[PDB]
Design an enzyme around this catalytic site. Structure first.
Site, PDB file in Angstrom:
ATOM      1  N   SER A   1       0.711  -1.036   0.351  1.00 20.97           N
ATOM      2  CA  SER A   1      -0.157   0.333  -0.315  1.00 20.97           C
ATOM      3  C   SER A   1       0.931   1.087  -0.035  1.00 20.97           C
ATOM      4  O   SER A   1       0.417   2.431   0.776  1.00 20.97           O
ATOM      5  CB  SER A   1      -0.855  -0.332   1.316  1.00 20.97           C
ATOM      6  OG  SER A   1      -2.028   1.291   0.989  1.00 20.97           O
TER       7      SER A   1
ATOM      8  N   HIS B   1      17.134  -5.055  -3.191  1.00 19.66           N
ATOM      9  CA  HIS B   1      17.083  -6.755  -3.820  1.00 19.66           C
ATOM     10  C   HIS B   1      18.033  -7.509  -3.399  1.00 19.66           C
ATOM     11  O   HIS B   1      17.597  -9.107  -3.595  1.00 19.66           O
ATOM     12  CB  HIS B   1      16.188  -6.907  -4.651  1.00 19.66           C
ATOM     13  CG  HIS B   1      14.511  -6.411  -4.588  1.00 19.66           C
ATOM     14  ND1 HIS B   1      14.196  -6.074  -6.851  1.00 19.66           N
ATOM     15  CD2 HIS B   1      14.120  -5.781  -4.719  1.00 19.66           C
ATOM     16  CE1 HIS B   1      13.038  -5.530  -6.580  1.00 19.66           C
ATOM     17  NE2 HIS B   1      12.935  -5.031  -4.534  1.00 19.66           N
TER      18      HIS B   1
ATOM     19  N   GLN C   1      18.368  -1.113  -9.568  1.00 16.72           N
ATOM     20  CA  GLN C   1      17.888  -2.081  -9.082  1.00 16.72           C
ATOM     21  C   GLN C   1      16.565  -2.913  -9.738  1.00 16.72           C
ATOM     22  O   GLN C   1      17.822  -3.994  -8.906  1.00 16.72           O
ATOM     23  CB  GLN C   1      15.833  -1.522  -8.478  1.00 16.72           C
ATOM     24  CG  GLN C   1      15.213  -2.357  -7.069  1.00 16.72           C
ATOM     25  CD  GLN C   1      14.035  -1.807  -7.003  1.00 16.72           C
ATOM     26  OE1 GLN C   1      13.254  -0.177  -7.614  1.00 16.72           O
ATOM     27  NE2 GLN C   1      13.903  -2.717  -5.841  1.00 16.72           N
ATOM     28  N   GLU C   2      16.927  -2.712 -10.960  1.00 16.37           N
ATOM     29  CA  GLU C   2      16.139  -3.937 -12.095  1.00 16.37           C
ATOM     30  C   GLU C   2      16.827  -3.607 -12.888  1.00 16.37           C
ATOM     31  O   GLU C   2      16.752  -2.301 -13.965  1.00 16.37           O
ATOM     32  CB  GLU C   2      14.777  -3.890 -11.697  1.00 16.37           C
ATOM     33  CG  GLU C   2      14.129  -4.438 -10.599  1.00 16.37           C
ATOM     34  CD  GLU C   2      12.603  -5.120 -10.415  1.00 16.37           C
ATOM     35  OE1 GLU C   2      12.401  -4.078 -11.586  1.00 16.37           O
ATOM     36  OE2 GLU C   2      12.096  -5.283  -9.543  1.00 16.37           O
TER      37      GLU C   2
ATOM     38  N   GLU D   1      12.277 -11.253  -8.156  1.00 17.64           N
ATOM     39  CA  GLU D   1      11.262 -11.009  -9.510  1.00 17.64           C
ATOM     40  C   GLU D   1      11.543 -11.698 -10.909  1.00 17.64           C
ATOM     41  O   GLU D   1      10.455 -11.421 -11.489  1.00 17.64           O
ATOM     42  CB  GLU D   1      10.976  -9.504 -10.209  1.00 17.64           C
ATOM     43  CG  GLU D   1      10.888  -8.538  -8.509  1.00 17.64           C
ATOM     44  CD  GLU D   1       9.717  -8.454  -8.356  1.00 17.64           C
ATOM     45  OE1 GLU D   1       8.313  -9.219  -8.999  1.00 17.64           O
ATOM     46  OE2 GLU D   1       8.535  -8.801  -7.486  1.00 17.64           O
TER      47      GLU D   1
ATOM     48  N   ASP E   1      15.139   0.135 -13.931  1.00 15.72           N
ATOM     49  CA  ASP E   1      14.652   0.701 -12.896  1.00 15.72           C
ATOM     50  C   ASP E   1      15.089   1.175 -11.871  1.00 15.72           C
ATOM     51  O   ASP E   1      15.749   0.846 -10.858  1.00 15.72           O
ATOM     52  CB  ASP E   1      13.302  -0.634 -12.481  1.00 15.72           C
ATOM     53  CG  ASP E   1      12.717  -0.076 -11.311  1.00 15.72           C
ATOM     54  OD1 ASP E   1      12.482   1.554 -10.513  1.00 15.72           O
ATOM     55  OD2 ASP E   1      11.567  -0.234 -10.858  1.00 15.72           O
TER      56      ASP E   1
ATOM     57  N   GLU F   1      13.505   3.897 -15.487  1.00 15.53           N
ATOM     58  CA  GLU F   1      12.325   4.267 -14.531  1.00 15.53           C
ATOM     59  C   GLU F   1      12.945   4.670 -13.417  1.00 15.53           C
ATOM     60  O   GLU F   1      13.466   4.330 -12.455  1.00 15.53           O
ATOM     61  CB  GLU F   1      11.930   3.301 -14.165  1.00 15.53           C
ATOM     62  CG  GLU F   1      10.851   3.323 -12.898  1.00 15.53           C
ATOM     63  CD  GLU F   1       9.571   1.630 -13.016  1.00 15.53           C
ATOM     64  OE1 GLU F   1       9.976   0.436 -14.043  1.00 15.53           O
ATOM     65  OE2 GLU F   1       8.987   1.559 -12.239  1.00 15.53           O
TER      66      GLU F   1
ATOM     67  N   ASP G   1       6.214   6.360 -11.427  1.00 16.85           N
ATOM     68  CA  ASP G   1       5.145   6.013 -10.826  1.00 16.85           C
ATOM     69  C   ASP G   1       4.330   7.342  -9.914  1.00 16.85           C
ATOM     70  O   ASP G   1       3.206   7.530 -10.318  1.00 16.85           O
ATOM     71  CB  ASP G   1       5.719   4.890 -10.561  1.00 16.85           C
ATOM     72  CG  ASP G   1       6.898   5.123  -9.332  1.00 16.85           C
ATOM     73  OD1 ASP G   1       7.794   6.327  -9.375  1.00 16.85           O
ATOM     74  OD2 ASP G   1       6.957   4.495  -8.583  1.00 16.85           O
TER      75      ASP G   1
ATOM     76  N   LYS H   1      -1.113   1.155 -13.073  1.00 16.50           N
ATOM     77  CA  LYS H   1      -0.477   0.436 -12.266  1.00 16.50           C
ATOM     78  C   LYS H   1      -2.256  -0.804 -10.696  1.00 16.50           C
ATOM     79  O   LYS H   1      -3.005   0.309 -11.391  1.00 16.50           O
ATOM     80  CB  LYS H   1      -0.087   0.249 -10.902  1.00 16.50           C
ATOM     81  CG  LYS H   1       1.485   0.636 -11.439  1.00 16.50           C
ATOM     82  CD  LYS H   1       2.105   0.458  -9.320  1.00 16.50           C
ATOM     83  CE  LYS H   1       2.069   2.236  -9.225  1.00 16.50           C
ATOM     84  NZ  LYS H   1       3.223   2.314  -7.470  1.00 16.50           N
TER      85      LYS H   1
ATOM     86  N   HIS I   1       3.111  -3.331 -11.589  1.00 16.50           N
ATOM     87  CA  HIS I   1       2.545  -3.903 -10.637  1.00 16.50           C
ATOM     88  C   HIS I   1       3.850  -3.479  -9.274  1.00 16.50           C
ATOM     89  O   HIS I   1       4.875  -2.493  -9.619  1.00 16.50           O
ATOM     90  CB  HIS I   1       2.339  -5.212 -10.626  1.00 16.50           C
ATOM     91  CG  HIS I   1       3.609  -6.730 -10.567  1.00 16.50           C
ATOM     92  ND1 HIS I   1       4.538  -6.473 -12.234  1.00 16.50           N
ATOM     93  CD2 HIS I   1       4.286  -6.589  -9.608  1.00 16.50           C
ATOM     94  CE1 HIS I   1       5.546  -7.071 -11.478  1.00 16.50           C
ATOM     95  NE2 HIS I   1       5.034  -7.197 -10.673  1.00 16.50           N
ATOM     96  N   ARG I   2       3.473  -3.269  -8.511  1.00 18.90           N
ATOM     97  CA  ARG I   2       3.920  -3.095  -7.322  1.00 18.90           C
ATOM     98  C   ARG I   2       4.389  -4.240  -7.053  1.00 18.90           C
ATOM     99  O   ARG I   2       4.155  -5.212  -6.909  1.00 18.90           O
ATOM    100  CB  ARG I   2       3.171  -2.654  -5.774  1.00 18.90           C
ATOM    101  CG  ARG I   2       3.308  -1.976  -4.528  1.00 18.90           C
ATOM    102  CD  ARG I   2       3.892  -0.818  -4.750  1.00 18.90           C
ATOM    103  NE  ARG I   2       5.898  -0.841  -4.822  1.00 18.90           N
ATOM    104  CZ  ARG I   2       6.991  -0.172  -5.597  1.00 18.90           C
ATOM    105  NH1 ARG I   2       6.788   0.929  -5.516  1.00 18.90           N
ATOM    106  NH2 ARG I   2       7.908  -0.373  -5.359  1.00 18.90           N
ATOM    107  N   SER I   3       5.330  -3.643  -6.613  1.00 19.16           N
ATOM    108  CA  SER I   3       6.640  -4.752  -6.355  1.00 19.16           C
ATOM    109  C   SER I   3       6.542  -5.919  -5.585  1.00 19.16           C
ATOM    110  O   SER I   3       7.308  -7.151  -5.467  1.00 19.16           O
ATOM    111  CB  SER I   3       8.251  -4.209  -6.034  1.00 19.16           C
ATOM    112  OG  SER I   3       8.651  -3.639  -6.923  1.00 19.16           O
TER     113      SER I   3
ATOM    114  N   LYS J   1       4.991  -5.746 -17.585  1.00 20.96           N
ATOM    115  CA  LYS J   1       6.243  -6.428 -17.014  1.00 20.96           C
ATOM    116  C   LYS J   1       6.127  -7.626 -16.477  1.00 20.96           C
ATOM    117  O   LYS J   1       4.925  -7.603 -15.592  1.00 20.96           O
ATOM    118  CB  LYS J   1       6.433  -4.925 -16.451  1.00 20.96           C
ATOM    119  CG  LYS J   1       7.522  -5.472 -15.355  1.00 20.96           C
ATOM    120  CD  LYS J   1       7.709  -4.214 -14.266  1.00 20.96           C
ATOM    121  CE  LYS J   1       7.953  -2.611 -15.005  1.00 20.96           C
ATOM    122  NZ  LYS J   1       8.064  -1.797 -14.120  1.00 20.96           N
TER     123      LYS J   1
HETATM  124 MG   LIG Z   1      10.585   0.846 -16.672  1.00 19.61          MG
HETATM  125 MG   LIG Z   2       7.956  -1.557 -10.817  1.00 18.57          MG
END
Ligand SMILES: [Mg+2]
Ligand SMILES: [Mg+2]
Lengths: 428, 67, 428, 67
Positions: A42, A155, A163-164, A205, A242, A287, A314, A339, A367-369, A390
């Site tokens: 949330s 992560h 991050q990603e 993920e 990201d 991102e 976002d 999202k 979507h949220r992680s 994604k």
């Molecule tokens: Mg992206």
């Molecule tokens: Mg994301």
């Protein structure tokens, strides 16, 4: 004729053993819908928050009683005798039952479950596929999968600050080859990382999480794996990032603390670093490159690169009828981030995609992680012509449920199914 | 047999050599250890076997649905 | 289950007594579609041309035998036993039967009639309305009518150089009030023109054709009629123009000959004239302001005004899969002009609207100045969220068939029907 | 009667005054000259009558479909 007689939610267990909430909608003629209530995070305050019990003794705050009682004792007595093929009236009735702005009375998860069960029942009643109930007859264009490959930052325990890292196979003729290409790139990267002598276990993920030294080492290793798989980078396989720059942004002084490289960069040096990374490596999407309270640097970034690199945001376009339309007016970024399980119904999703198609932006389904999923997002990604989905998930049995649901659409659109490829980068 | 190699929901069992014969790679699920699916290899080496193992993980073969 | 058994076209007479071609499609279960073949003009060369007999002894070149034999003896034996709810396969089959690029083998009118009869039959089989078969469930936004009010130039004998002046009621809450406002503005303008002592007979496309002296006199008279009707111009009632500058462009020297004002303007003075007209009068749209062979002036015009005045262009974005994508790349104009009965099927219409939504443009549903109509265009204007429809027609019984078809959609979307209003001017 | 005023597919016939009584405006089609539709005027003057005439042309009253 297809009047709703029973709306009923229950508690079932997933493959992880976590309790999930499952909403069912019956009709008079025998049509049947079924959707899963998400149980995610949330984050944010200006958007629709998701409501759980929050009990840390009951699955770390993913309780189900306050999510199933709101469906069985409040939403259900207001939906008897109502026609099920009228989606907009149901989506207005649910918001009128909620009352507030951030959906905090019923939860933004209990409304979405009912508003997708009542749209999977109407597609069963009319005997048409769900991607044609939501999108017409000319909904035939499957999206480009963004496939998480190397994690870093929060992560993992490594010196990678981004991050990603993601790969985006855009040189494939159809979706099935676009999935096979990624299936081979993962094997090539596991071969390269085992040649270097690192850990090749699957991280959060779906991507790896090795022990690397810098961002440049990761961008060397991924491009070397793409070359050893047999594909040409920059023409068939792009990349993405990201950055999650909010995690290493020190608020008190406004300087970015790159803990991986050990260098404190100011807000004008980060854009100079991103220009170097785009000039050396085929990045096509960034991102959250800068924090959302760095307007003097963010307005710089959205014009130094915003004509050849997609820049999503976002919380810059946080999902609300007022706040998502705020960053459109001053024109920062050139893509927003849809999202679904933080945005509410299925009417507000298709309005928030349309308001981004008008102002020249580009929707990216995301979507949220930490959320689970459902499998109706693969029909929203075809019906809206979103372009990029994604395909990450916290477990494998949700990731494969994304893949099979997007492959059972191409097998119905047999001689007809398009694919974006590089045509999704129109504003670049 | 050769390299059973238990994976998450499946087993990728290269057969016994059945002497003076080229071995074959088959993908079984947890039950039904006698049906077998040919994943359309070209040589059935160790590298091809590792390719099939890393293709059963990440969840895409072209030959089976992989629930 | 709903297989096509009979495709059959015949010849019927309209209210004008002209022969029209009427395509019917039967099914096995009893579903039924019916569409009218247009009988318009074949202007342009880089787009799909319409095919008639061309016999001047038979209704000045609107013959029907070569349009009905192509349906009854070529298209019909290829569509037996085919499923009727598969629109994309039919639209690919018809183009493969045609063979050429400009649809010149079967005519671009005989293909459109079959490809809308086979889409009005599928909406009858599924028992859903036609604006939801074509556009999903979230197709609820009625367009803004562009209503021709004063003609000039070629259509009349007066000193008005602009061809058509239009009004666009954008300050109305719903479509029915937007139509009532125009119904009152026409009465106020007839009162003003009778006070001046002019001819108040209805001209070509529904507007008047008085004996005026200049363009400024017409723009004074229309704004005075809007003020006397009770509405505030610039906030509730905008204007538009159709300049038709190709008619007074002398090719040999490249200078515009304004015969109304008697002044020969060069290509840099026309933009200075349009800035004065926008600064004095609430014009919001200009059509064909400069000739399509005046790139040195057209590139000037698309940046002197292109951020606060919509600039549409027909032959600049002439309807083809190659030529409509040519003017997108260099970026001239900020709106294109969808003409349905010059573009072919219903698949190419919804692709040509989507390729304009991507590149930031704005679709305007329109028609060539002599074609008849059909009534399915009012469902394409709702299902695509086009935003502006041009409700003109060569006779009253086609104009009223546009109005009633757009009013019988709002009466089905009773608590749900949106309206654009001023929200269609997003790129201004 | 007063100002029959033939229009394209209709007639807009204000009645006879029916002495010491306010007249009314009704819209008939070509046949059926005794049914009548009230177009919701306020006064039934000559200007209101001309408004109804110019509203039957251009094809929109709020009271009848106007085919
Ligand atoms: Mg992206
Ligand atoms: Mg994301």
């Amino acid at each position: 004729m297809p009047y709703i007689v029973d709306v009923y939610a229950r508690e079932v267990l997933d493959s992880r053993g976590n309790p999930t909430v499952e909403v069912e909608v019956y009709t008079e003629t025998g049509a049947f819908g079924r959707a899963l209530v998400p149980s995610g995070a949330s984050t944010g305050e200006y958007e629709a928050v998701e409501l759980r019990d929050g009990d840390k003794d009951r699955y770390l705050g993913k309780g189900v009683l306050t999510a199933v009682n709101n469906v069985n004792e409040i939403i259900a007595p207001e939906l008897l005798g109502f026609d099920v093929t009228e989606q907009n009236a149901i989506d207005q009735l649910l918001i009128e039952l909620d009352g507030t702005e951030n959906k905090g009375k019923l939860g933004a998860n209990a409304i979405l479950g009912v508003s997708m069960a009542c749209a999977r029942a109407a597609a069963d009643f009319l005997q048409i596929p769900l991607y044609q109930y939501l999108g017409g007859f000319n909904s035939k264009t499957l999206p480009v999968p963004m496939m998480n490959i190397v994690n870093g930052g929060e992560h993992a325990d490594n010196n990678v600050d981004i991050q990603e890292f993601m790969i985006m196979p855009v040189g494939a003729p159809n979706f099935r080859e676009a999935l096979r290409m990624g299936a081979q790139i993962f094997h090539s990267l596991k071969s390269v990382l085992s040649a270097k002598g690192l850990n090749t276990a699957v991280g959060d993920e779906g991507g790896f999480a090795p022990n690397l030294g810098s961002n440049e080492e990761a961008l060397q290793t991924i491009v070397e794996a793409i070359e050893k798989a047999g594909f040409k980078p920059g023409e068939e396989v792009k990349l993405a990032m990201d950055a999650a720059s909010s995690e290493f942004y020190n608020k008190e002084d406004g300087k970015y603390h790159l803990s991986g490289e050990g260098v404190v960069k100011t807000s004008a040096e980060m854009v100079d670093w991103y220009e170097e990374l785009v000039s050396k490596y085929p990045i096509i999407s960034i991102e959250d490159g800068l924090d959302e309270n760095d307007w003097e640097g963010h307005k710089l970034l959205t014009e130094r690169l915003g004509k050849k690199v997609q820049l999503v945001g976002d919380d810059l376009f946080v999902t609300n009828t007022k706040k998502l339309s705020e960053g459109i007016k001053n024109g920062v970024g050139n893509s927003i981030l849809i999202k679904v399980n933080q945005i509410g119904t299925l009417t507000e999703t298709f309005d928030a995609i349309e308001m981004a198609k008008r102002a020249g932006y580009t929707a990216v389904i995301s979507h949220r992680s930490g959320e689970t999923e459902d499998s109706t997002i693969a029909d929203i990604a075809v019906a809206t012509n979103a372009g990029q989905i994604k395909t990450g998930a916290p477990s494998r049995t949700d990731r494969v449920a994304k893949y099979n649901q997007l492959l059972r659409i191409e097998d119905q659109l047999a001689e007809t199914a398009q694919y974006h490829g590089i045509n999704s980068f129109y504003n670049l | 047999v050769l390299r059973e190699e238990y994976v998450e929901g499946y087993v990728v069992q290269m057969w016994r050599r059945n002497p003076s014969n080229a071995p074959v790679i088959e993908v079984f699920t947890e039950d039904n250890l006698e049906e077998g699916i040919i994943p359309e290899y070209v040589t059935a080496n160790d590298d091809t076997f590792d390719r099939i193992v890393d293709a059963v993980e990440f969840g895409y073969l072209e030959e089976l649905e992989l629930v």
